[PDB]
């Protein structure tokens, strides 16, 4: 059972060999997934090696300031124009409130 070929052009009880993998000598070429050489996708999963290990998820990239105008970096103009140039950006304190007494 589960070994016939039931071919087109009517009916035919042609026996076939059920094989997951083949060399194409007697059918369709079915290479094993255990080979990067024979892989169709650039990023395989199953083949284990030092050069294949993946996170399975996109990783955050670096973003350096002052690298082109078109870049997705943070603001550069605000930091320079509309900002206190004192190397502290304010009083060297922790409870400053703008003249008025702190909360505490």
């Amino acid at each position: 059972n589960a070994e016939r070929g039931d071919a087109d052009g009517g009916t035919s009880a042609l026996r076939v060999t059920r094989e997951q993998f083949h060399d194409g000598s007697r059918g369709l070429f079915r290479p094993h997934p255990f080979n990067r050489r024979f892989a169709r996708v650039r990023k395989p999963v199953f083949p284990i090696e030092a050069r294949n290990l993946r996170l399975m998820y996109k990783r955050k990239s670096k973003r350096r300031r002052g690298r082109g105008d078109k870049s997705n970096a943070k603001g550069i103009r605000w930091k320079h124009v509309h900002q206190q140039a004192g190397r502290y950006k304010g009083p060297r304190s922790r409870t400053f409130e703008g003249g008025k007494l702190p909360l505490y």
Binding site: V45, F46, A50, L53, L55
Partner: protein, 51 residues
């Protein structure tokens, strides 16, 4: 329970990298600062009478 577990490359990634980073140890790659060099402190060109 040892030899019959799902294949998890994700875990292996970390596990692999751990050892590699460990192996590194301490690198001597260093660069000098402006003050670390041997030099003076005085100016070179005063503002007056020289554009």
């Amino acid at each position: 329970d040892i030899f019959g577990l799902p294949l998890r490359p994700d875990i292996l990634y970390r596990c692999y990298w751990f050892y590699r980073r460990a192996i590194a140890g301490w690198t001597e790659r260093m660069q000098l600062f402006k003050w670390e060099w041997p030099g003076s402190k005085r100016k070179l060109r005063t503002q007056q009478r020289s554009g």
